[PDB]
RNA sequence: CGCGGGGUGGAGCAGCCCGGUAGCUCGUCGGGCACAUAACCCGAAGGUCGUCGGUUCAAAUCCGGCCCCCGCAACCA
RNA sequence: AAUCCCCCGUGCCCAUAGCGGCGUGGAACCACCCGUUCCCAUUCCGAACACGGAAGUGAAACGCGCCAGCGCCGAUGGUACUGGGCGGGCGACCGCCUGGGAGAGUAGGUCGGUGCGGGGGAU
RNA sequence: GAGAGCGCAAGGGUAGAAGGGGGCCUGACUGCGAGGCCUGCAAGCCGAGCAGGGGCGAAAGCCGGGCCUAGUGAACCGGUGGU
RNA sequence: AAAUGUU
């Protein structure tokens, strides 16, 4: 969870539409609605997919955080310099693939990306592979 | 001695034309300039070596200009982006075949280890650098004449194509090989 | 900084656009381009001031053209 | 070619080497 | 990408700017002492010249003077060319000159 | 204005000055140059103040 | 998170007004006198100036980061 | 000249004009080339710039000629976005009507186009 | 295909070069200014061309401070030089 | 002027 040698330290808000089509593992939980998603829910699902599996499982993570937070700490009258950043987030707009799987094709594998998509406040869906388009 | 080496070249190479082609004579193998670089860099101090080293190589050959700037200002010693470093001299046609056969024939075994001058692996692709020389062994002069001899360089350039187009040339001219 | 907010420094801005677009009969002395760096090289009958400001030199019609690799040129073509 | 500054090399090839048989280079050790 | 004929494209260019004057460009190869008078703003050649068209041969250098002495009379034969200049290839010395000194017989104002 | 100076140069024949700047440390040698006064001759002035 | 001061031998300190050049006090070791100690008398060793880079013919000395030590207040799970 | 074809100077379109691979030129033109006093010049060198000129040669450089592996421009058909209208949503946000309409990708494209003036060939 | 450099911060720009090196010199000057961009006033900015007298160049030509945008503050009251 | 010594 290092994001070291940063460019700029404070950022802005606002986002509405989104893309980034189907991926190519064996199974991946796919989003439906937009929501910010912190750097800790990702780690929670990364632990809960692993310790279900078989003391062995493999996972490909496709979501990474950039945008920083602000809090203005506890009881402050407004109107000063907005600071004090903290642990910080990513963005997933309608449809791009989170967390594709090791590929052992069982409901042994299909259950873990139900119990991982049971935190993570988005509403998800489960798919597999027949896409086979072309990119660069 | 200059025409004496001219006729040696021009009566050994038409004898030794008989391994390539016979066509387009003016398109085989020929020699070019010779650069000699003193390359001291020890006169980051006073400009006393810039006169003192400029009267023995310039007394063997043509004058010794100060192509001596340093382009940058790394650490080591505060050179002060400038000063002088290089001590280059260029030789073209006449002092060319003065200096070449003068260093080759009647002077060179004043050096030790006697393995010609070549450990046979110069590994050029283009115009074939060489040059194994530590300063003031046998040029013409008298037994010390300076303090702290500093080692010189030689870089012949040719118009050859493969490695053997100057390996065979400089070996049928002389220049003993093998380590 | 130190532990607060140290900003709130800015400057009232110059204008520097294009003043005398295609067509538009001009007379000798009008400023055609205020710019910061050379983005429009001069042509015939167009001078170039001290800080890269183009200005008409004789009377006529401002006419834009390009060159491609070399760059955009402007020049004022005589009136009739 | 600057004609005044470079050193003099008119006869500084035509000698035998200012004494060659003391210089020990002609038949000196280079043979097999 | 450009092998040291950059001065020719830099010096000549700085000349085009003042388009109130007409140019003569010379060539200076061996049996080739050529010149041309170009009117700039309409790209043509206004009048030609000669080194071997007019033959004028020998084995010499004074043919360079001869060509300019021809360009003088051939300029004032149409008579309008009062104002013109002269560039060249590189350095302006002997061979490239006599052309200027030959055009200085007809009153070419340079 | 620590090392720079406001110097004010006069003539080798006459009156008042022609107002310029000087360094005082890297040159020191009392400068002199050539200019056109209101007596129309292009004479040489000297650092006088 | 904060306010100002400092990094020099084993420890404590001058040298930083303004560019050239490293010293003092305690303290460790070795030889002296004395029946053996204490005290006293001679001599020697122990660094570059926290850490990395810039400016000049020349940085302990002027500039920028990085990291430590001195004191004041409010608080998280 | 006042009908066509190779060469040599100048301009404009402006990389669908370039890089890389192999052949092909001197009878005429051109460049290497031979020398070094003056005409000149090289922080040193006639390597460049300049001078006086047979030979030998077209190998190097330059022009026509070919081959799409690298580059370079690139359709039709769709979709995102949106000028102007109406709708549904607690909240991030979505839908339909009417005019416009990209970027990436696919089939494919080319190893340039063109004036002005001189010297020769078909007379 | 310029991704280096240009006294100091960032953006624009530039090798058909404002970038590095030598040759000679002070236009880092004086009856002076048509015409404009900006603007509540006051301020700031660019400027072809005549006349005087001069530098570099064979000529063509260019020069009234620096590659450009920051290094500055109205009046009143006083000081020193000429008219 | 100038100290101490049973382990």
């Amino acid at each position: 969870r290092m994001k070291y040698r940063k460019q700029q330290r404070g950022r802005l808000k606002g986002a509405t539409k989104g893309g980034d089509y189907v991926a190519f593992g064996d199974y991946g939980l796919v989003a439906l609605e937009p929501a910010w998603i912190t750097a800790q829910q990702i780690e929670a699902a990364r632990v809960a997919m692993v310790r279900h599996f078989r003391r062995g499982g493999k996972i490909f993570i496709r979501i990474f955080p950039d945008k920083p937070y602000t809090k203005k700490p506890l009881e402050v009258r407004m109107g000063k310099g907005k600071g004090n950043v903290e642990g910080y987030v990513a963005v997933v707009k309608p449809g791009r693939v989170m967390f594709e799987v090791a590929g052992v094709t069982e409901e042994q594998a299909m259950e873990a990306l139900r119990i991982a998509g049971h935190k993570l406040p988005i509403k998800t869906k489960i798919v597999r592979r027949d896409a086979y388009d072309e990119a660069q | 001695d200059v025409a004496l080496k001219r006729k040696y070249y021009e009566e050994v190479r038409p004898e030794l034309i008989r391994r390539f082609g016979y066509q387009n004579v003016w398109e085989v193998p020929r020699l070019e300039k010779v650069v000699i670089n003193q390359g001291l860099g020890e006169a980051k101090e006073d400009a006393r070596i810039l006169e003192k080293a400029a009267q023995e190589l310039a007394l063997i050959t043509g004058q010794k200009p100060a192509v001596t700037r340093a382009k940058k200002s790394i650490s080591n010693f505060k050179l002060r982006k400038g000063m002088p470093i290089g001590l280059r001299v260029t030789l073209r046609r006449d002092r060319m075949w003065i200096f070449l056969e003068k260093l080759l024939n009647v002077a060179l075994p004043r050096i030790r280890d006697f393995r010609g001058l070549n450990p046979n692996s110069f590994d050029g692709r283009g115009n074939y650098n060489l040059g194994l020389r530590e300063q003031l062994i046998f040029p013409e002069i008298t037994y010390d004449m300076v303090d702290a001899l500093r080692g010189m360089d030689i870089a012949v350039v040719t118009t050859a194509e493969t490695d053997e187009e100057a390996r065979a040339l400089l070996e049928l001219l002389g220049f003993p090989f093998r380590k | 900084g130190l532990g607060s907010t140290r900003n709130g420094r800015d400057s009232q801005a110059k204008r520097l656009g294009v003043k005398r677009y295609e067509g538009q009969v001009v007379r000798a002395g009008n400023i055609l381009v205020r710019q910061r760096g050379t983005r429009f090289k001069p042509g015939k009958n167009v001078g170039m001031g001290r800080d890269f400001t183009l200005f008409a030199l004789v009377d006529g019609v401002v006419e834009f053209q390009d060159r491609g690799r070399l760059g955009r040129y402007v020049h004022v073509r005589p009136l009739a | 070619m600057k004609e005044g500054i470079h050193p003099k090399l008119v006869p500084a090839r035509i000698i035998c080497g200012c004494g060659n048989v003391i210089e020990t280079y002609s038949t000196k050790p280079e043979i097999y | 990408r450009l092998t040291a004929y950059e001065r020719r494209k830099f010096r000549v260019r700085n000349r085009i700017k003042r388009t109130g004057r007409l140019r003569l460009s010379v060539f200076r190869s061996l049996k080739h002492i050529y010149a041309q008078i170009i009117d700039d703003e309409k790209g043509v050649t206004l009048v030609s010249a000669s080194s071997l068209a007019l033959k004028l041969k020998g084995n010499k250098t004074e043919v360079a003077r001869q060509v300019g002495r021809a360009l003088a009379e051939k300029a004032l034969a149409l008579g309008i060319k009062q104002v013109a200049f002269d560039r060249g290839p590189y350095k302006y010395h002997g061979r490239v000159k006599a052309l200027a000194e030959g055009a200085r017989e007809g009153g070419l104002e340079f | 204005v620590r090392l720079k100076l406001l110097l004010e140069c006069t003539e080798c024949k006459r009156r008042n000055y022609a107002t310029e700047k000087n360094k005082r440390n890297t040159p020191n040698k009392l400068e002199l140059r050539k200019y056109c006064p209101w007596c129309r001759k292009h004479t040489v002035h000297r650092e006088v103040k």
Side-chain angles (χ1 to χ4, degrees), chain A, chain B residues 1-26 28-179, chain C, chain D residues 4 7 11-12 17 19 29, chain E, chain F residues 2-49:
Chain A
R1 296 277 76 80
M2 295 296 107
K3 271 74 62 178
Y4 60 93
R5 198 258 174 271
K6 200 178 292 184
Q7 174 77 42
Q8 304 287 323
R9 193 172 58 85
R11 291 181 58 85
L12 266 57
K13 295 188 276 282
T16 182
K17 183 260 300 174
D20 188 75
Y21 71 98
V22 181
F24 293 95
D26 268 337
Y27 301 102
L29 61 95
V30 61
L32 286 176
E33 73 272 13
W36 271 357
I37 169 171
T38 61
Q40 299 169 357
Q41 304 171 357
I42 297 167
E43 182 69 27
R46 192 187 66 83
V47 172
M49 283 182 176
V50 165
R51 71 170 63 253
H52 182 198
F53 287 164
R54 198 187 53 194
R55 76 274 302 151
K58 292 179 172 175
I59 42 169
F60 300 154
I61 290 96
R62 200 179 290 272
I63 302 302
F64 186 76
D66 193 6
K67 287 176 65 68
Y69 271 168
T70 52
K71 193 177 278 184
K72 191 183 285 183
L74 189 64
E75 52 178 10
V76 180
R77 307 180 74 176
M78 299 190 293
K80 281 170 74 172
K82 77 176 284 183
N84 300 118
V85 302
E86 63 180 4
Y88 51 101
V89 301
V91 54
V92 280
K93 303 176 77 179
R96 72 186 187 94
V97 173
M98 287 80 78
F99 297 160
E100 73 182 1
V101 80
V104 297
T105 67
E106 195 66 29
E107 68 270 18
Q108 181 181 2
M110 194 175 70
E111 189 182 4
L113 49 86
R114 174 188 177 272
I115 70 103
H118 216 73
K119 46 191 66 63
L120 293 172
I122 319 165
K123 292 183 68 66
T124 64
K125 190 171 86 272
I126 299 164
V127 292
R128 61 182 61 87
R129 292 185 72 180
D130 53 0
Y132 285 165
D133 63 353
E134 178 69 26
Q136 65 179 356
Chain B
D1 292 333
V2 48
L4 298 175
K5 194 261 182 293
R6 286 177 65 85
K7 295 296 179 70
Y8 183 76
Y9 173 75
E10 298 176 357
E11 297 299 322
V12 173
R13 75 97 183 267
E15 292 178 351
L16 271 299
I17 194 170
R18 289 303 94 216
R19 60 183 72 188
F20 291 107
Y22 184 79
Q23 91 293 355
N24 223 348
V25 34
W26 264 121
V28 207
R30 80 186 36 62
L31 267 71
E32 293 293 328
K33 62 181 175 67
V34 163
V35 182
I36 168 164
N37 187 0
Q38 183 57 256
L40 51 95
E42 298 172 355
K44 83 281 287 182
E45 308 298 328
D46 297 332
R48 56 182 182 176
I49 308 298
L50 192 143
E51 59 87 20
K52 187 255 287 182
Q55 59 175 353
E56 66 275 19
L57 276 75
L59 268 289
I60 294 302
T61 52
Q63 197 181 4
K64 190 169 194 284
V67 183
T68 45
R69 290 92 178 92
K71 307 294 186 292
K72 282 173 75 173
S73 302
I74 29 167
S75 184
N76 324 342
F77 211 22
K78 268 341 131 191
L79 9 69
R80 297 290 169 268
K81 60 166 293 278
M83 316 235 322
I85 168 88
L87 267 218
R88 176 183 175 179
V89 183
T90 305
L91 281 73
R92 188 75 61 187
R93 284 177 179 172
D94 196 1
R95 277 80 64 196
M96 177 71 205
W97 282 346
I98 298 300
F99 181 77
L100 183 61
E101 59 91 19
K102 186 176 180 181
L103 188 141
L104 179 56
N105 298 113
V106 205
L108 184 60
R110 178 68 65 193
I111 206 65
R112 80 279 296 146
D113 180 72
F114 298 110
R115 296 292 184 269
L117 287 174
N118 299 320
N120 212 169
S121 179
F122 54 90
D123 291 336
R125 189 263 305 158
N127 304 118
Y128 298 138
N129 192 10
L130 287 170
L132 277 292
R133 179 62 169 167
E134 190 173 358
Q135 200 277 129
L136 203 145
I137 310 298
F138 47 82
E140 68 184 4
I141 42 91
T142 56
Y143 64 81
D144 50 356
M145 291 294 102
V146 296
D147 295 331
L149 60 100
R150 60 190 64 90
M152 292 183 286
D153 296 326
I154 291 96
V156 298
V157 288
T158 60
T159 316
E161 299 295 323
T162 192
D163 188 72
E164 296 297 325
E165 292 299 322
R167 185 76 65 85
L169 178 69
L170 273 68
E171 182 58 34
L172 67 88
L173 190 145
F175 289 157
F177 286 160
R178 294 189 65 84
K179 277 76 178 175
Chain C
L2 185 39
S4 216
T5 165
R6 305 206 160 153
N7 298 120
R9 294 166 179 265
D10 204 357
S11 63
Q12 63 181 359
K14 281 82 174 176
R15 311 302 172 96
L16 50 91
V18 175
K19 307 295 192 290
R20 292 293 181 265
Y21 312 103
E22 180 73 26
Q24 284 184 352
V25 287
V26 298
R27 57 200 299 267
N30 294 319
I31 296 174
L32 274 65
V33 168
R34 284 290 187 98
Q35 65 190 357
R36 190 69 60 193
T38 304
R39 298 176 61 88
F40 291 94
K41 303 277 178 64
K44 293 179 260 77
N45 294 321
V46 166
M48 189 176 180
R50 190 183 67 83
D51 54 358
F52 302 147
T53 297
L54 302 183
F55 65 100
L57 199 147
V58 295
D59 185 81
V61 172
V62 177
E63 198 273 334
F64 285 95
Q65 72 177 2
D66 296 332
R67 189 66 69 88
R69 183 179 65 248
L70 302 179
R72 303 178 181 181
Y73 292 173
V74 313
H75 38 86
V76 174
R77 293 184 181 274
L79 196 67
Chain E
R1 287 180 288 113
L2 293 176
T3 62
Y5 284 172
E6 315 195 300
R7 342 203 158 297
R8 165 271 265 300
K9 204 188 162 135
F10 79 179
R11 178 171 168 189
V12 150
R13 244 196 211 311
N14 166 74
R15 246 217 298 81
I16 286 151
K17 182 193 293 179
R18 198 270 189 91
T19 180
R21 297 289 295 272
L22 283 75
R23 61 185 173 93
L24 72 92
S25 64
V26 301
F27 189 76
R28 195 184 68 84
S29 177
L30 273 303
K31 188 56 189 66
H32 206 198
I33 306 300
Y34 275 182
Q36 288 184 353
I37 293 172
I38 290 97
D39 194 359
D40 187 74
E41 63 177 359
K42 179 66 172 65
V44 290
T45 292
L46 194 146
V47 75
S48 298
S50 295
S51 172
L52 55 88
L54 273 297
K55 188 174 287 294
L56 297 169
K57 296 202 294 290
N59 204 359
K60 61 177 78 173
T61 307
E62 203 272 336
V63 295
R65 179 71 62 83
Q66 295 289 320
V67 173
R69 293 174 67 244
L71 282 175
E73 54 86 19
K74 187 168 63 62
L76 83 147
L78 187 58
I80 301 171
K81 276 84 66 173
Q82 291 292 321
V83 283
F85 46 103
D86 100 283
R87 26 176 281 155
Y90 242 64
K91 180 83 70 158
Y92 169 92
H93 207 290
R95 248 146 89 43
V96 102
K97 197 162 325 171
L99 289 168
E101 296 184 357
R104 286 172 184 173
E105 292 186 355
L108 269 295
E109 299 179 355
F110 65 95
Chain F
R2 178 83 279 279
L3 299 173
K4 290 295 187 72
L5 302 180
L6 297 86
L7 89 170
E8 211 181 3
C9 63
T10 184
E11 296 191 358
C12 296
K13 298 191 292 182
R14 281 183 289 111
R15 57 181 66 86
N16 220 174
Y17 306 157
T19 179
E20 207 168 356
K21 285 278 180 66
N22 194 2
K23 174 63 180 69
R24 200 263 300 160
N25 197 359
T26 51
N28 303 121
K29 276 78 179 173
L30 204 150
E31 70 181 358
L32 59 91
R33 72 277 186 197
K34 189 178 289 290
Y35 274 105
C36 175
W38 65 280
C39 291
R40 299 172 181 88
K41 199 257 181 67
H42 249 304
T43 75
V44 34
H45 302 45
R46 202 155 136 181
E47 41 153 322
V48 164
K49 151 273 148 105

